[PDB]
Design an enzyme around this catalytic site. Structure first.
Site, PDB file in Angstrom:
ATOM      1  N   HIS A   1       0.818  -1.223   0.042  1.00 45.69           N
ATOM      2  CA  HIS A   1      -0.040  -0.040  -0.031  1.00 45.69           C
ATOM      3  C   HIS A   1       0.716   1.449   0.014  1.00 45.69           C
ATOM      4  CE1 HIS A   1      -3.485   2.498   1.118  1.00 45.69           C
ATOM      5  NE2 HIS A   1      -4.153   1.403   0.402  1.00 45.69           N
TER       6      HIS A   1
ATOM      7  N   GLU B   1      11.927   0.814   0.305  1.00 46.61           N
ATOM      8  CA  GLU B   1      12.806  -0.278   0.607  1.00 46.61           C
ATOM      9  C   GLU B   1      13.250  -1.075  -0.466  1.00 46.61           C
ATOM     10  OE1 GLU B   1      10.151   0.550   1.962  1.00 46.61           O
ATOM     11  OE2 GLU B   1      10.401   1.067   3.847  1.00 46.61           O
TER      12      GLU B   1
END
Lengths: 368, 371
Positions: free
Chosen positions: A247, A300
């Site tokens: 998300h 990330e």
């Protein structure tokens, strides 16, 4: 007992900050009002971004680290720096924040912060190999270049560019669990060394977030198969979890993810071609099995690609995130110092009522 | 976009706890519904009170410490135990809190908590002196007795009771700054070793409270002069502030201060009469100068007397308070693990608006590369 009590201080405003603004509704991150995308595009080193976040103006940079080899060897680079920073107070004579002025606090923060980088380089290089001579290290001209030289010996200049790109983008991102911990410890009036040590402890948590993803195994399956679509389909079809996506955080594409991806192409990362193909396939499939949600790349994902491009091992990546975040930590510790308020929340007792000690289970197993 | 903001989360409810109740209006403290003044009165050792807080019942007390000599010698006893605990995880193989069951986390906390006591005893004893043989330590029975034996060599039995009194009264007192720090670190999923290490760091702060007050020089002067009222008068008159006396914590006398004064008298502490004389003189003179304020004797006052009676030096006293608070830390760390909710508040940005790097003060001093 407040009805519908939401634990975890979820959404509760605790602080007002002048340091940095993550504009998630606007899709941009600003350090003291300066977009991070301007900082990286003009190649501002991490040493100066540390000054901008902490001081509020470009100026006194981050000083060169001083010769002090690591005394902690536990095999966990996070543990080495966390325990090493705490021990700096007695040797360096760090007074509590309650007993020093703002000028001393900043210099103590700047000294201990660049020392934390030196620890991580020494821990990464390991004890089964002699240390890099100081004369060789002094040839470097920036703090980031010194870190690479202390660790690798003869670092690739492109890898030094990538580390600056990562460290600037990860320097400060608002109120974290680690940043909150650093301010709570600093609110007690303790010295800056203990506050930084505690922040590293909260940073080691799996749920803290921001740690580079474990996507290197995934980037190898695509390397072998040579078809990114099938590998992404397989992981989802086989009931496994697709890594590095989820998300959205900002209203759209994360600005940090954009600049890190741009850093990969600009520096010619070998994994860049595969990484983009995986990103396109992962988003096409994930937005197809649930076309109602907003799904965007995690920062990330590209953090792992950029750090891997600079020869950072998988078990060293969490330390690299800690190294960059020292800029935000020190700035918030200094801001918390000026606030002069202790953080002391309240709890509501819902346990058992009064009772004699004998009424508790296991009283016969107690002596005297 | 603020309101009449009250910074610092003052009075904000963050958790609900079943552990202990700091009844400030009622003037009593209860661990799991059991009054501390009943626990000390029946002489329950610190190991069992550790079990009561963490477990909720008096079964499976605190295990004996295993042989593991202190590897950190920094000169500060707080620093030695804070850094030593964090190094336990790699060698003992502590997994993160997210990847272990409740049964394992309880065991890991108990194993590390008693080791933290071993570090403080070793650090206090010092490097200039051979360590106490393990067989001598094994002759002790309780955890507190082992701590004193590992440190003092041949401890006085009265001093051991004085520490069981202090440690029980300081095991848990609610959602303080250090306990909050421990719960925040635990909520991230980090291993118990890092959570305890972070809690000690927040404990070292002067503003955390509970660090035993520096009343020893004052108690020395009254012994020499013999006029407790005059010494209290002299300290106030020349601008200094009395130590161990300030604003009230509860509605009235703190039960932690009451049991510590009771313990100091029960064990025949040599400073008890001089301390009671000072306390009476302090309260009389302080309440006369500010009749409109509620002045009460701090628990730090009688904590210093009890620790000094047990031959605890001044610089070791903050570590002793850390030793007792490990009971409350472990209980709250375990409670936070079951809650399974990250602690993350928010903040409001009130800083500068968007601007270019060239418009920042001092831009002329930033060196940049460009190919």
């Amino acid at each position: 007992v407040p009805e519908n009590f939401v634990p975890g201080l979820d959404g509760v405003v605790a602080f007002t900050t002048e340091i940095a603004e993550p504009d998630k509704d606007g899709g941009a991150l600003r350090y003291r009002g300066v977009d991070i995308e301007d900082l990286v595009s003009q190649r501002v080193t991490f040493g100066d971004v540390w000054a901008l976040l902490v001081d509020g103006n470009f100026g006194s940079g981050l000083p060169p680290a001083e010769p002090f080899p690591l005394p902690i060897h536990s095999g966990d680079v996070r543990v080495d720096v966390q325990a090493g920073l705490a021990m700096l107070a007695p040797i360096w004579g760090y007074a509590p924040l309650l007993d020093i002025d703002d000028a001393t606090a900043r210099q103590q923060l700047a000294r201990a912060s660049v020392m934390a980088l030196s620890y991580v380089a020494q821990s990464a290089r390991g004890i089964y190999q002699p240390a890099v001579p100081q004369r060789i290290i002094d040839e470097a001209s920036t703090v980031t270049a010194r870190f690479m030289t202390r660790w690798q010996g003869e670092p690739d200049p492109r890898h030094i560019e990538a580390i600056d790109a990562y460290w600037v983008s990860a320097a400060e991102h608002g109120m974290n669990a680690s940043t909150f911990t650093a301010r709570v410890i600093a609110s007690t009036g303790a010295d800056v060394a203990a506050a930084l040590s505690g922040a590293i402890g909260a940073m080691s948590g799996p749920l803290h977030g921001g740690a580079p993803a474990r996507v290197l195994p995934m980037l190898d399956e695509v390397e072998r198969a040579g078809d990114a679509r099938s590998v992404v389909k397989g992981i989802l079809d086989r009931g496994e979890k697709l890594m590095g996506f989820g998300h959205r955080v900002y209203r759209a594409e994360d600005p940090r993810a954009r600049v890190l991806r741009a850093a990969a192409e600009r520096l010619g990362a070998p994994r860049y071609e595969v990484a983009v193909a995986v990103e396109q396939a992962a988003l096409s499939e994930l937005r197809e099995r649930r076309p109602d949600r907003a799904i965007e790349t995690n920062v990330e994902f590209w953090a792992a690609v950029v750090l891997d491009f600079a020869r950072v091992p998988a078990n060293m990546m969490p330390a690299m995130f800690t190294c960059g975040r020292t800029a935000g930590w020190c700035a918030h510790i200094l801001e918390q110092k000026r606030l002069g308020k202790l953080v002391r929340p309240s709890a509501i007792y819902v346990g058992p009522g009064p009772r004699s000690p004998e009424s508790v289970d296991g009283w016969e197993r107690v002596l005297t």
